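Ticket 4471: requesting a sanity check on a complex prediction with beta-carotene. Repro inputs:
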Amino acid sequence: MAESNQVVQAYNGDPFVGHLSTPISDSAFTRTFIGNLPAYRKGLSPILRGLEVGMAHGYFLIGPWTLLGPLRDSEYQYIGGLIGALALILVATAALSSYGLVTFQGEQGSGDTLQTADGWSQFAAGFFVGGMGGAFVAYFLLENLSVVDGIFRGLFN
Amino acid sequence: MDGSYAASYLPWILIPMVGWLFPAVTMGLLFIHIESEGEG
Amino acid sequence: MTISPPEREAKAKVSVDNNPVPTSFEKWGKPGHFDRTLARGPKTTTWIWNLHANAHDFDSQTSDLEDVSRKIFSAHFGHLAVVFVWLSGMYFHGAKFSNYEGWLADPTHIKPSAQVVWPIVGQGILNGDVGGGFHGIQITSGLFYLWRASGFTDSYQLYCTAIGGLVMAALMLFAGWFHYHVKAPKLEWFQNVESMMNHHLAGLLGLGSLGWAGHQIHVSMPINKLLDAGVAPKDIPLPHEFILEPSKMAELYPSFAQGLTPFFTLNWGVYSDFLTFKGGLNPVTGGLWLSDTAHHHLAIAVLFIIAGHMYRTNWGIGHSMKEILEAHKGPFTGEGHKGLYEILTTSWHAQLAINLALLGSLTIIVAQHMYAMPPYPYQAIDYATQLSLFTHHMWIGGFLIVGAGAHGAIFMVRDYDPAKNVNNLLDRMLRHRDAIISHLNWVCIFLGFHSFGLYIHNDTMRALGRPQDMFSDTAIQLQPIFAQWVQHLHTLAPGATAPNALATASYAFGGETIAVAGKVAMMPITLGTADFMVHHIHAFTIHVTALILLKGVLYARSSRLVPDKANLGFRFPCDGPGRGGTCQVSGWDHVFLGLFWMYNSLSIVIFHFSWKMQSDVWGTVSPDGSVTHVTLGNFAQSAITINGWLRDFLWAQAANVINSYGSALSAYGIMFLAGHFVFAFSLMFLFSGRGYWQELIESIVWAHNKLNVAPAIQPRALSIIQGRAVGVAHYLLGGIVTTWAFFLARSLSIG
Amino acid sequence: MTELSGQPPKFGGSTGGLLSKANREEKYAITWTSASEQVFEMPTGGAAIMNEGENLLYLARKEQCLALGTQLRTKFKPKIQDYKIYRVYPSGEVQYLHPADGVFPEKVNEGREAQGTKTRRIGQNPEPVTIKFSGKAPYEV
Amino acid sequence: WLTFYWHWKHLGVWSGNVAQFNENSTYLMGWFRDYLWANSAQLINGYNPYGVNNLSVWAWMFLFGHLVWATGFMFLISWRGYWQELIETIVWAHERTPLANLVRWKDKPVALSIVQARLVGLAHFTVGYVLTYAAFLIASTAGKFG
Amino acid sequence: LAQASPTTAGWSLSVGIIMCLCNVFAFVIGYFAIQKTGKGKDLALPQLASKKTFGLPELLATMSFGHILGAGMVLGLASS
Amino acid sequence: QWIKDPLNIRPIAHAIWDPHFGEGAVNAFTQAGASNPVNIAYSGVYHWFYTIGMTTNQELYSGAVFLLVLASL
Ligand code: CLA
Ligand code: CLA
Ligand code: CLA
Ligand code: CLA
Ligand code: CLA
Ligand code: CLA
Ligand code: CLA
Ligand SMILES: CCCCCCCCCCCCCCCC(=O)OC[C@H](COP(=O)(O)OC[C@@H](O)CO)OC(=O)CCCCCCCCCCCCCCC
Ligand SMILES: CC1=C(/C=C/C(C)=C\C=C\C(C)=C\C=C\C=C(C)\C=C/C=C(C)/C=C/C2=C(C)C(=O)CCC2(C)C)C(C)(C)CCC1
Ligand SMILES: CC1=C(/C=C/C(C)=C/C=C/C(C)=C/C=C/C=C(C)/C=C/C=C(C)/C=C/C2=C(C)CCCC2(C)C)C(C)(C)CCC1
Ligand SMILES: CC1=C(C/C=C(\C)CCC[C@H](C)CCC[C@H](C)CCCC(C)C)C(=O)c2ccccc2C1=O
Ligand code: SF4
Ligand SMILES: [Cl-]
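Returned structure tokens:
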């Protein structure tokens, strides 16, 4: 009740922190949704976080080159997409690992097991395995798109 | 299984989405919710 | 004490002070009198520049809001008198130095001209043969087409109009003098915003279009009806004869036989022969049906007069705008529009920012609506007039918009009172300026990558012998399907969602190909991949200009870098080489950068217009029915690469400009080179800084002291702000003059 | 430096205040007393309301604190000159900063030791060639 | 100016038409039209809606030099404070975007310095200058006589 | 000719049955909706029942509104 | 189609999409003139919509979009 029908408030109750509590920044839905993504989900080991993020990213990264790459109008369309996505995930893993190497040179913190050298390295390992796996399974599903189509239509029974 | 109606590629992916993904996700959310032991 | 009239108030909210400022000439000989930092006189050359820099900065001259208001009111009268002098000059040159009657007798075989050049030092060649034995400069302002639509048939009517314009200028000048010196209205009078809005809606815009509907019905429409019927202009009665002899109207319009009775009895349909909803264009002239425009002005007048009754003044009925504003507040926006009424009734700069933004947007809307719905007889067939009017109104609109940014910033620095803006819309805008600007920043980056970057992709693919990997209508397509859908909706509208309309509002959306003489006046303007790409270029450049000016306004008070920017003012060069360097943090410098970006945006807009109209719309039509365009439909395949614009647009069409020597177009080549030179010249001021020049001036002052010729008014290098102002003024002047010469040579050399 | 006291100004929040630097590196505090609840301009954007009595506010930089201080002592009908500015570290250490010796720096106060003073003119700096391959510059010698 | 001079005169000489330079070099429209405008025709046609030839690389480099020149203009006209404040907004956005939150910079992003802006703008300007003119010189002379 | 059909001065249906009726309706909603009914410069004294009830500006404005309503309604009921 | 011959045509409710179907069931449920598996409606909804004046698929679609809006309200 009262007089505050207002939907925007000071972020975390401190009006002098440069941020605002808004329906996009700090609603219950965004808190629960962002807070349960692999990056923030409570209790997860960084290996599983990396694995999940890599699965999602490797899976979806096959598409752009698959439909729009230079081999899209060749007999090696899906292989071209796969090669592109694999090389991209390799470069991304190198970027993640270089980041971990440079930002965790000093004393290791304690609150965030992902924000350590060991944790960020585990995240990179999981991300590599998940990205390569997701890219290869997206490629495998696309390369056998006819059997997936017949499966979804019942063309085999 | 086919369809001559408009945009007949929609059941193709919506039937798996309604039968597999929607129930899996909603049951998983409700499962983690009813088991949540946060005080209150 | 000057002239003392009686009083002239009739239970009015009129309130004035009698003779506050006596008429006198002494201060005319005291330059800089209005600025205390200038009145003593000069000591350095900077004193001169600032004298011009602050001449109209009425805030910086006096802190009294009433005196500022009075200065502004009289300045407005003076400006109106200037505009009257200019317009009467146009009409006088039409009366005495034009081929207007000759053009009127045969507008398809003669080019409009209204400036004759004296023969001296060879420049007489500019008097090109425009037809009918007339020699002069071809005009692209569309004055002849306006004068024909209005129903002018004689030099003497234009001359009488010029004399009326001079008398009007004298009247405006006297009113300005009178209301500054004799009867100056009080601040209470200016703040009557409700009454001012009632009068500007019902009286200025409503009665304006009502009187013009009257002139169109009684003068324009019968005279043009006879002109398009092939009647020679000398055989047509004078405008007043249709009012003295109503049988002339009645035989041109049978509804006139019934008179005014159908009007007062709501039997308006009887008037359907002269109050029309035809749509489309006039088949004889290529312009909008004058009857349509008269019906349009009648309806606009009724609308505006009705609108002029919303606000409360002296009679209890009506609205308080303060109340309305205060009622509009929501869960997302705190106190809402509270405080806006006080801002817009005490701050001249706030009103000017709003009004500049809207007036510039309106001028742009005018360009866009007049090209595709050509309102004047024979304007669409005159491709030079079409291009020139479009681009001219574009540039005026862009300048007004940038000025709106400037004056939003000036409001923030000078008139914003934080105690009067607690948790209202302005306050919350300030309180999440970072979110706003970081997001606008990202949208501009995304729009640039996915518009210009598409062009770079296409250039690289085409150079690599890979046409099938391009973004084009024949490869990877970017169809603007929503614009195509709305065009289809407009084409279907006359038969469905606009029943009582006979034709489309514009043939650009689709339909027939309206051609007058052998040239197309208007035809369906189709949209494809190149049109998609250039529309996103437009969205990108507009977004960047908005980014710059909006950041200028929102950070004029402070930033994380400079938390006391407000104390530094609206116009200042920086706050030193510290903090890494703070040059160009002021709102003025944001306006300075936004000028360049607006110039960029509009250059691309007008190039798009020129190339698309020459490629896909304009052209000549054979008696067989087919159309052959000016640049042979090259837009779709060439406008999708930067090389295409460099070669098939700029390089190809510049051939007229650079070969203009030895003909009447020679001045356009002259001014093409002139714009180029001014552009290059601006780079000296923009790429350098005043310290170097001050030292060079030191050496030259030594040279002068050597021969005992140094001036008492010591030479100083231009200030940092002035260096930027000169640089940007010359950049815009040179570039715009270049494009102007180019456009005029092209559109005049293409049939 | 004992423990900062004072109510925070009445303010609805903004995006222009503290960032990560405040907790990772350093932040700044300004206290001041006001004879009345009244509106002032936040150096980080917008309007805020100071409480009657003591006020304590955290900002990201020393300059924002001094800008607020000038606003307090030059833009209110009865001036506010009792403001104090402190530097605050993540460890909790509070370093009193301004006014350094309890007296504003614009006016002389006994007990201050001259720093950065030179017993010469600017034109009496030594030629750079005379001090090259050293670590100094003509104004450092 | 020097290289324009040399190239236009030697074009006339090599082609046997010294008269073009002798008669049209006395006015600047002559340079603008007979030298610059004319000798671009093959250059700008290295790639086309109709195909590609051996001058494609030089047309692409011509446009590239234009683009680099124009980019240098940005560092030369817009000065630092405007950029540092914009980067402050971008810094804010990064610190407050989830997921991207996970990553933090090792060096604080700040706008380029005053002198650095002059140097980098000049470097772009000069690169574009040289590459544009080299593309034009090479392509024109090899299309006429190559 | 394709033109929306109006009506000649009916002076039975066009008048009271529409125009005067719409004017009375505007009278009613103005009586029940105008904040300042009799705060005009012009008193126009004898306050009555409806025809000239509260103030000259109330009367004039509600009558202009009734004419807008009546014009719209007459024209609409006669096709368009 | 049902509007033309309402006594000899069976109204269909919606299309079937079941990857479990074999050839026999696919054939059995391409019925009532349809070119794909379909169920026939027994809610009387065709008779209702036809009686109240609706005659085209565009009208039914506009009704369904309007009901989307009403539910939103
Ligand atoms: C019993 C009363 C009655 C009846 C039934 C009618 C009947 C009719 N009127 Mg009328 N009218 C009435 C009362 C009545 N009117 C009154 C009291 C007034 C005074 C306000 C009007 C004034 C009025 C006008 C001005 C017009 C009509 C029109 C019409 C015809 C409309 C056909 C149509 O589908 O429109 C069109 C359907 C649309 C979906 C168009 C809507 C799209 C617009 C352009 C969106 C614009 C948004 C706008 C800018 C936002 C407003 C700004 C702000 C104030 C919110 C119709 C036969 C029109 C007519 O006569 O046609 C010849 C017309 O021009 N009426
Ligand atoms: C001969 C020694 C050697 C060899 C066999 C490898 C082999 C490998 N490394 Mg390693 N690396 C080495 C030394 C070596 N590394 C050293 C000394 C460092 C410290 C600077 C690194 C740091 C490094 C990082 C951060 C990462 C790898 C990764 C990888 C794997 C990815 C494939 C690749 O990078 O291409 C083959 C590489 C070579 C033939 C050259 C090896 C020697 C140079 C100095 C390595 C430099 C690493 C470079 C920054 C990352 C390459 C980017 C990538 C796009 C190729 C691969 C099996 C990636 C990985 O997936 O790890 C799980 C990754 O994230 N390396
Ligand atoms: C409650 C009404 C309703 C019902 C019972 C159905 C039933 C069905 N629909 Mg349909 N649908 C509806 C409304 C409905 N639809 C509307 C309004 C639209 C337009 C937006 C669509 C668009 C749609 C498409 C494109 C497709 C289906 C399809 C299907 C079939 C497979 C299920 C599915 O994939 O749905 C998916 C549904 C959606 C993507 C849109 C959501 C439907 C509405 C708006 C939400 C209903 C919420 C409901 C009232 C909540 C109450 C639940 C209750 C138990 C508490 C199924 C027989 C598939 C089919 O045709 O099979 C061959 C198919 O591909 N529907
Ligand atoms: C119906 C009454 C009316 C009309 C027609 C105007 C018209 C105008 N006002 Mg004004 N104003 C009015 C009432 C009116 N005002 C009232 C009641 C107030 C007090 C609240 C103000 C206070 C006000 C201020 C403070 C300012 C204006 C300004 C302006 C001018 C700027 C717009 C412009 O340039 O357009 C186009 C210009 C023209 C069409 C030129 C014609 C101008 C002549 C003198 C008007 C003659 C019309 C007159 C009624 C005779 C018509 C009768 C017959 C010939 C048909 C404009 C001519 C601004 C200005 O420019 O100051 C000079 C200005 O700053 N008005
Ligand atoms: C400001 C613009 C303007 C100007 C000044 C004129 C000027 C003129 N018009 Mg024109 N006209 C205009 C706009 C204008 N018109 C518009 C917008 C239209 C489209 C509707 C027309 C269409 C038009 C027609 C068809 C005719 C004119 C005519 C005339 C001339 C005689 C009318 C007159 O004034 O006598 C004085 C008018 C009166 C004394 C009106 C009294 C008659 C009625 C019964 C009084 C009712 C008034 C009452 C308050 C309303 C209640 C009615 C209800 C109770 C039933 C005159 C010189 C006439 C003419 O001479 O043709 C050449 C003519 O036939 N005009
Ligand atoms: C109705 C529109 C309008 C109004 C009345 C004002 C009013 C005002 N403006 Mg604003 N502004 C406007 C539009 C407007 N402006 C536009 C369109 C722009 C974009 C360019 C700006 C951008 C702007 C800036 C950046 C500034 C102002 C400033 C000012 C104030 C000082 C005026 C002045 O400079 O004196 C004297 C005027 C001059 C010395 C102009 C001479 C130089 C011009 C540009 C040369 C033009 C060349 C010519 C057009 C073509 C070449 C001819 C040549 C070859 C001979 C004044 C109160 C100044 C201020 O401090 O505000 C308080 C200031 O800083 N305005
Ligand atoms: C052609 C010259 C040029 C170019 C390239 C730019 C570039 C840019 N300006 Mg700028 N500007 C210029 C001239 C130029 N300016 C001049 C002369 C001025 C003086 C008035 C300004 C003043 C100015 C201001 C005040 C602002 C900008 C802004 C911007 C940015 C807009 C956002 C964007 O487009 O994102 C995308 C980037 C591009 C489209 C650039 C091209 C990228 C290509 C096509 C793809 C790159 C390929 C790949 C990366 C190559 C890698 C090679 C490998 C070996 C590493 C942008 C990066 C605005 C901004 O920052 O917005 C946020 C801003 O506020 N400009
Ligand atoms: C081509 C167009 C089709 C594509 C769709 C693109 C969707 C764009 C997002 C929808 C608009 C959101 C604004 C209305 C939503 C809206 O106004 O809600 C209402 C809400 C305020 O409502 P209140 O209840 O406070 O109303 C009280 C008023 O009286 C004001 O005091 O506005 C805000 O919360 C401010 C936040 C605006 C920040 C969002 C703006 C984002 C900028 C980008 C928008 C692009 C629009 C381009 C179209 C030209
Ligand atoms: C000015 C005015 C008047 C003139 C009014 C005019 C000029 C027109 C009024 C038209 C009206 C008032 C139309 C109302 C339509 C209401 C509807 C359509 C309501 C509900 C529909 C529902 C609930 C859903 C129906 C369904 C749909 C969607 C289907 O498709 C299937 C069937 C079903 C499920 C039932 C008069 C002079 C008269 C009185 C004075 C004021
Ligand atoms: C709708 C929506 C949304 C969105 C979403 C998204 C955007 C997503 C996507 C999604 C995705 C993206 C997904 C995924 C999936 C994936 C997967 C599932 C994977 C995989 C992989 C695999 C399985 C692999 C395997 C392997 C390995 C590992 C090794 C060996 C080899 C192989 C291959 C065997 C949201 C909620 C936000 C909001 C609302 C709406
Ligand atoms: C050249 C230059 C100067 C030197 C320019 C000066 C000193 C101006 C010289 C102007 C002369 C004195 C006036 C000539 C122009 C007149 C205004 C035109 C009047 C013509 C009438 C007589 C008809 C600067 O001071 C400067 C400052 C900051 C950045 C860049 C620069 C810069 O590039
Ligand atoms: S370069 Fe000029 S503008 Fe920039 S900080 Fe230095 S003095 Fe100021
Ligand atoms: Cl090309």
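Notes from triage: The two ends of chain G are 34 Å apart (CA to CA). Leaving this open until the requester confirms.
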